[model samples]
Target: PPVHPFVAPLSYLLGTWRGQGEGEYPTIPSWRYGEEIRFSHSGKPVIAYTQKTWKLESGAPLLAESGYFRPRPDGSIEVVIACSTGLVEVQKGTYNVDEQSIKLKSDLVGNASKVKEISREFELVDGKLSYVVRLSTTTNPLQPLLKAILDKL
Candidate 1:
């Protein structure tokens, strides 16, 4: 089936992407992990998204999230995600058609989440998807949380 018109702008993100990511936080030691992300659509205006991460060395499960990416006709984007750790995030952002990049900031974090703010950026460079996440918590100021480059599979 053809992709929905509303989701066609992000059609480049469809399918599975796999990569390795590095994570760091002030409260915990830095680590590396493997990540897989999937994007799909079902003739709907929104794109379905799911992500999973595991310890790189042991392949132990780390985190999983499910979400939707809703792109508006006016170029604005909204995303809502629920994490396995019980945190939910509502993000708003914009996408650059020429650059094939997106920048998102959390508008709300619920479920008693300790995180105060989160920002995510994604760009397509040389046919590879690269992204970075920065976040702040109750105790720590905003800083780099994770960075990864993935290949479409």
Candidate 2:
């Protein structure tokens, strides 16, 4: 059934994202390819929720995330998130909506242990499709180091 426009505010994210990303730790580069992200919404008053996951080529889950993110009436972005590991978190920032992107700055601290995170997001036109990501944990990225080349499923 089609959702009423006034009901599900998160309908903006109802689609699939697939892409590749690479990161370095201890000078070792780890690559992720064929990554899939699915976003959906239920008609609700509160911010809508989203889930993300990364899997190995063999189909084993590497990392997972779930959260609620939305554009507030005051022009800010609110993100509430958790992971498969023992982690609970919150992140807040501003979303540059007019540019079809959300720019968020946050210190994503871990609940159970000592961990620090900082990141930014940018939406870009990557050829025919578009992409965006929140990348880096220690420094602000001038560009999206992690990206999703998205398409409607």
Candidate 3:
């Protein structure tokens, strides 16, 4: 059978990409890191996703996450992700597409401790991927927490 047509919006994300990332939060100091992210098809309705990070100055490994992106015929999308930091996020949002780019946002976040909420915007333009993440924690104000740009590798 043919792959579900709903996956079309996420098909462009199928590949490995690596780049640099900078993170800053109201509660923590700023830092730069090396980041690698991947997405691939598994012959299912969803795409597999993984992301890894490392400390730039020392090359020390940081954290990792693996997840899946599922698209719905209604144009809504769901992302279930688990991370090395003992964080699990069930994010729900939409996929926006156009002649020049594709954009994704996680508007609703669920089931978290220590974290109040997280929102992310991922955009792909001209084969380059960039993302911005904002989060509100139990003790910190809602603010931008991460940003990165990755090129397909």
Candidate 4:
């Protein structure tokens, strides 16, 4: 079946992606991590999303998250994600159909979450998926936390 029209604009993300990323915060040392992201759909108007990351050097697991992407007729994107560390984020954003890019900012955070805010951006260019994430914690202001470029598989 063809992709759902409501989510067809996000078709470029419908695959598994692997890559390495770097993360840093004022309280933690900068480190490298390996990541995998998968986007899937089951003939629905929403896109299912999952992500996992591990320490690049030790292969020890770091973070994992699962979510859904909801695209509306008004061109607004709604993302709902639940993280392994008891954090849930409801994000609002927009996507560029022509550029194959998405930008999201967290509108709400729930459950044992110390995160004050988060922003994420993803762009697909030349078969590569690149993304950056910025985070703000209860003690820190918004700052770059992670960035990576992944190859689709």
lDDT of all predictions = 0.92, 0.54, 0.80, 0.90
Off by over 4 Å in 2: 1-11, 26-28, 45-49, 52-56, 120-148
TM-score of each: 0.94, 0.67, 0.87, 0.92
Clashes of 4: 0
Q: Judging by TM-score against the true structure, name the best candidate.
A: 1
lDDT per residue as tens, model 3, 4-34: 5777667778789999999998778998999
Tell me how far candidate 3 lies from the true structure as C-alpha RMSD in angstroms. 2.5
Give the range where candidate 2 is weakest over 10 consecutive residues by summed lDDT. Answer: 126-135
User: On a 0 to 1 TM-score scale, where does candidate 1 land against the true structure?
Assistant: 0.94
Sort every candidate by lDDT, greatest first.
1, 4, 3, 2
lDDT of 1: 0.92
> Candidate 4: where are CA atoms >4 Å away?
none
Better of 1 and 4 by lDDT: 1
Better of 2 and 3 by lDDT: 3
Clashing pairs for model 4 are: none
Model 1 Cα lDDT, one tens digit per residue, 30-94: 88889999999998999999999998888899999999999987889999999999989898999
